């Protein structure tokens, strides 16, 4: 719907932030991928919070 759509991931697991730089997420949460350049991706959750989550708990979500 936009020329540059937002990219999303779905978490496979519950993950609890170990510090305030990481982002706690739940299994099946949908997360905006803000930065996937490293092993820890910066993502944003539905509440607008952002932080880092491990790449390996995330599955890419297909564009509509």
């Amino acid at each position: 719907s936009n020329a540059q759509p937002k990219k999303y991931a779905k978490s496979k697991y519950d993950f609890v932030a170990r510090n305030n730089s990481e982002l706690s997420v739940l299994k099946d949460d949908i997360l905006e991928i803000l930065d996937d350049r490293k092993q820890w991706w910066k993502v944003r959750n539905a509440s607008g919070d952002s932080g880092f989550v491990p790449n390996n708990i995330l599955d890419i979500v297909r564009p509509p």
């Binding site: 697991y13 490293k38 092993q39 880092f52 491990p54 708990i57």
Partner: peptide
């Protein structure tokens, strides 16, 4: 469950 990758974000 998967082991976490090494941290590669910056902290403080």
């Amino acid at each position: 469950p998967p082991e976490l990758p090494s941290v590669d974000y910056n902290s403080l």
